[PDB]
Design a protein around this motif. Structure first.
Motif, mmCIF file in Angstrom:
data_model
loop_
_atom_site.group_PDB
_atom_site.id
_atom_site.type_symbol
_atom_site.label_atom_id
_atom_site.label_comp_id
_atom_site.label_asym_id
_atom_site.label_seq_id
_atom_site.Cartn_x
_atom_site.Cartn_y
_atom_site.Cartn_z
ATOM 1 N N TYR A 16 1.894 -5.284 3.707
ATOM 2 C CA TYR A 16 0.761 -5.915 4.420
ATOM 3 C C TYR A 16 0.946 -7.415 4.481
ATOM 4 O O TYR A 16 1.824 -7.908 3.812
ATOM 5 C CB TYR A 16 -0.520 -5.567 3.685
ATOM 6 C CG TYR A 16 -1.082 -4.312 4.234
ATOM 7 C CD1 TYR A 16 -0.612 -3.094 3.784
ATOM 8 C CD2 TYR A 16 -2.010 -4.324 5.296
ATOM 9 C CE1 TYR A 16 -1.108 -1.873 4.302
ATOM 10 C CE2 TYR A 16 -2.493 -3.119 5.853
ATOM 11 C CZ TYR A 16 -2.044 -1.882 5.328
ATOM 12 O OH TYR A 16 -2.489 -0.647 5.788
ATOM 13 N N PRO A 17 0.137 -8.166 5.261
ATOM 14 C CA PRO A 17 0.521 -9.583 5.470
ATOM 15 C C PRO A 17 0.380 -10.357 4.196
ATOM 16 O O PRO A 17 -0.512 -10.042 3.403
ATOM 17 C CB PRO A 17 -0.496 -10.090 6.474
ATOM 18 C CG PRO A 17 -1.142 -8.875 7.040
ATOM 19 C CD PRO A 17 -1.110 -7.840 5.964
ATOM 20 N N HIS B 15 -10.361 -4.083 4.043
ATOM 21 C CA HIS B 15 -10.873 -2.693 4.170
ATOM 22 C C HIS B 15 -9.769 -1.719 3.829
ATOM 23 O O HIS B 15 -8.696 -1.694 4.437
ATOM 24 C CB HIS B 15 -11.363 -2.349 5.588
ATOM 25 C CG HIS B 15 -12.502 -3.199 6.053
ATOM 26 N ND1 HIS B 15 -12.323 -4.318 6.852
ATOM 27 C CD2 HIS B 15 -13.839 -3.111 5.808
ATOM 28 C CE1 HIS B 15 -13.502 -4.875 7.082
ATOM 29 N NE2 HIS B 15 -14.438 -4.162 6.468
ATOM 30 N N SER B 16 -10.080 -0.910 2.849
ATOM 31 C CA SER B 16 -9.213 0.079 2.332
ATOM 32 C C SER B 16 -10.167 1.248 2.126
ATOM 33 O O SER B 16 -11.075 1.444 2.919
ATOM 34 C CB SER B 16 -8.660 -0.411 1.008
ATOM 35 O OG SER B 16 -7.494 0.277 0.707
ATOM 36 N N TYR B 17 -10.016 1.976 1.037
ATOM 37 C CA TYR B 17 -10.579 3.298 0.960
ATOM 38 C C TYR B 17 -10.489 3.838 -0.476
ATOM 39 O O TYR B 17 -9.524 3.533 -1.230
ATOM 40 C CB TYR B 17 -9.804 4.243 1.918
ATOM 41 C CG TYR B 17 -9.978 4.054 3.435
ATOM 42 C CD1 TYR B 17 -11.057 4.639 4.146
ATOM 43 C CD2 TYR B 17 -9.033 3.341 4.166
ATOM 44 C CE1 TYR B 17 -11.178 4.488 5.528
ATOM 45 C CE2 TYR B 17 -9.135 3.190 5.546
ATOM 46 C CZ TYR B 17 -10.203 3.759 6.212
ATOM 47 O OH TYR B 17 -10.247 3.567 7.575
ATOM 48 N N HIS C 288 -7.047 4.869 -2.843
ATOM 49 C CA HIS C 288 -5.779 4.363 -2.319
ATOM 50 C C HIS C 288 -5.045 3.542 -3.370
ATOM 51 O O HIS C 288 -5.675 2.882 -4.218
ATOM 52 C CB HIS C 288 -6.006 3.557 -1.037
ATOM 53 C CG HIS C 288 -6.241 4.408 0.177
ATOM 54 N ND1 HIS C 288 -5.826 4.040 1.439
ATOM 55 C CD2 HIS C 288 -6.835 5.617 0.317
ATOM 56 C CE1 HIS C 288 -6.149 4.987 2.297
ATOM 57 N NE2 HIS C 288 -6.749 5.958 1.637
ATOM 58 N N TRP D 33 -2.495 0.451 -4.569
ATOM 59 C CA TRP D 33 -1.794 -0.798 -4.210
ATOM 60 C C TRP D 33 -1.072 -1.379 -5.408
ATOM 61 O O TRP D 33 -1.454 -1.126 -6.574
ATOM 62 C CB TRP D 33 -2.782 -1.850 -3.791
ATOM 63 C CG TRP D 33 -3.620 -1.441 -2.720
ATOM 64 C CD1 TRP D 33 -4.718 -0.594 -2.780
ATOM 65 C CD2 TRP D 33 -3.524 -1.868 -1.357
ATOM 66 N NE1 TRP D 33 -5.290 -0.472 -1.526
ATOM 67 C CE2 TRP D 33 -4.583 -1.250 -0.644
ATOM 68 C CE3 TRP D 33 -2.639 -2.706 -0.662
ATOM 69 C CZ2 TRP D 33 -4.764 -1.445 0.703
ATOM 70 C CZ3 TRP D 33 -2.832 -2.905 0.694
ATOM 71 C CH2 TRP D 33 -3.880 -2.278 1.357
ATOM 72 N N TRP E 258 0.872 -1.188 0.000
ATOM 73 C CA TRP E 258 0.000 0.000 0.000
ATOM 74 C C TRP E 258 0.895 1.219 0.000
ATOM 75 O O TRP E 258 1.853 1.302 0.792
ATOM 76 C CB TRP E 258 -0.912 0.040 1.234
ATOM 77 C CG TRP E 258 -1.680 1.398 1.414
ATOM 78 C CD1 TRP E 258 -2.617 1.923 0.564
ATOM 79 C CD2 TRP E 258 -1.597 2.317 2.519
ATOM 80 N NE1 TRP E 258 -3.100 3.116 1.036
ATOM 81 C CE2 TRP E 258 -2.489 3.399 2.228
ATOM 82 C CE3 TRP E 258 -0.862 2.334 3.726
ATOM 83 C CZ2 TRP E 258 -2.641 4.512 3.077
ATOM 84 C CZ3 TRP E 258 -1.010 3.415 4.580
ATOM 85 C CH2 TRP E 258 -1.907 4.501 4.251
ATOM 86 N N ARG F 211 -8.765 -12.985 0.426
ATOM 87 C CA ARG F 211 -8.799 -12.212 1.672
ATOM 88 C C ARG F 211 -9.522 -10.923 1.447
ATOM 89 O O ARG F 211 -9.143 -10.145 0.575
ATOM 90 C CB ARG F 211 -7.388 -11.895 2.161
ATOM 91 C CG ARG F 211 -7.331 -11.232 3.514
ATOM 92 C CD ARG F 211 -5.949 -10.994 4.093
ATOM 93 N NE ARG F 211 -5.097 -12.163 4.055
ATOM 94 C CZ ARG F 211 -3.786 -12.125 3.817
ATOM 95 N NH1 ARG F 211 -3.150 -10.956 3.590
ATOM 96 N NH2 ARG F 211 -3.105 -13.271 3.802
#
Ligand SMILES: COC(=O)c1ccc(CNC(=O)[C@@H]2C[C@@H](O)CN2C(=O)Cc2cc(C)no2)cc1
Lengths: 86, 139, 102
Positions: free
Chosen positions: B36-37, B48-50, B53, B55, B26, B45
């Motif tokens: 991130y994991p 929650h993001s926005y 944003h 990636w 991100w 998976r």
């Protein structure tokens, strides 16, 4: 339509033009047949698979598989891939 | 080249259709990549993001590049989730060959495999987020 | 389905693709197209097994799981009308190996 690519050890590989034109090196060597004084058949048979792989999957949404490379041929293939620009 | 701070929740699905361990990354409001994991090869998976944003996705072990919904950057954009399909690209045969070779050999011993010196420098030029962000941050 | 084959005979090797429903005789046309030689006067094999002109390649056992762009399946090819030569395919060059890696 088809062209011929020949290995250092004489085997012939008959493949589509377009598939072959995937290598600018090959693109230039036809401008028909092309001899490769320095790539043995076990390397150039993979090149060709890579051509057929590239053409099948370039521009595709369904998940694409890994192009596999044996460990024994990796070094020869790297050198070919470098020479052939592909 | 950073995330837009919109504060608008946006719900994502990362589906990993690659045979690699995926590392989602991100881009932070100041442009810094943030990891991130990691997402296993078959696996999915909810996230929650926005809105707005950024990636991008990479192989978790070796940083090879991967595509999302075909382009290089995913931006959460209705009625529930937005789909981020993570795929292998069609590598070049050269890049691919580099990968195997990097993967088979302690990087100390590149020096000692009999190949042209333009190839040694190529093997040691490992893919990396920072570099790619600079190719990207110029188009 | 496309099926991705390697048509192999002697030091000759053809990369082509075909439908799973295409027939052996139709593969034979493709070869004719290319190697300038007509369906009679050529025979096709899977491994050692002699293939029937009227069967599908998907019945002959070339399928999508089986004949993949990046690991195509082999089809053996033979010639002469006039007594037919036996199926010979030259192996490929051997890699060296390895070293100092594993
Ligand atoms: C297994 O763990 C996960 O994959 C996981 C996934 C997402 C989350 C929580 N969400 C985030 O970190 C999102 C992703 C990205 O949009 C950045 N982020 C933030 O919450 C930071 C933020 C704050 C505000 C306000 N807008 O964005 C926690 C854990």
């Amino acid at each position: 339509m088809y062209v011929k690519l020949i290995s250092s050890d004489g085997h012939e590989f008959i493949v589509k033009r377009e598939h072959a034109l995937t290598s600018g090196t090959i693109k230039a060597m036809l401008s028909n047949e092309v001899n490769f004084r320095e790539i043995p058949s076990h390397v150039l048979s993979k090149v060709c698979m890579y051509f057929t792989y590239k053409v099948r999957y370039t521009n595709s949404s369904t998940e694409i598989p890994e192009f596999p490379i044996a460990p024994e041929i990796a070094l020869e293939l790297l050198m070919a891939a470098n020479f052939l620009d592909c | 080249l950073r995330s837009v701070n919109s504060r608008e929740p946006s719900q994502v699905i990362f589906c990993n259709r690659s045979p690699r361990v995926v590392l989602p990354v991100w881009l932070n409001f100041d442009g810094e990549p943030q990891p991130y994991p990691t997402l296993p090869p078959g696996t999915g998976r909810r996230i929650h993001s926005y809105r707005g944003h950024l990636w991008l996705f990479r192989d978790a072990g070796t940083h090879d590049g991967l595509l999302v919904n075909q382009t290089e950057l995913f931006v959460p954009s209705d009625g529930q989730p937005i789909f981020a399909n993570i795929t292998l690209p069609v590598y070049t045969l050269k890049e691919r060959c580099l990968q195997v070779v990097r993967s088979l050999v302690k990087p100390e011993n590149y020096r000692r495999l009999d190949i042209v010196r333009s190839l040694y420098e190529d093997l040691e030029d490992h893919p990396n987020v920072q570099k790619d962000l600079e190719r990207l941050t110029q188009e | 389905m496309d099926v991705f084959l390697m048509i192999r005979r002697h030091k000759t090797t053809i990369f082509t693709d075909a439908k799973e429903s295409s027939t052996v005789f139709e593969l034979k046309r493709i070869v004719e197209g290319i190697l300038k030689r007509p369906p009679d006067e050529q025979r096709l094999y899977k491994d050692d097994q002699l293939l029937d002109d009227g069967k599908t390649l998907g019945e002959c056992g070339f399928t999508s799981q089986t004949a993949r762009p990046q690991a195509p399946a082999t089809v053996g090819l033979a010639f002469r009308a006039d007594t037919f030569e036996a199926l010979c395919i030259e192996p490929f060059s051997s890699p060296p190996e390895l070293p100092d890696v594993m």
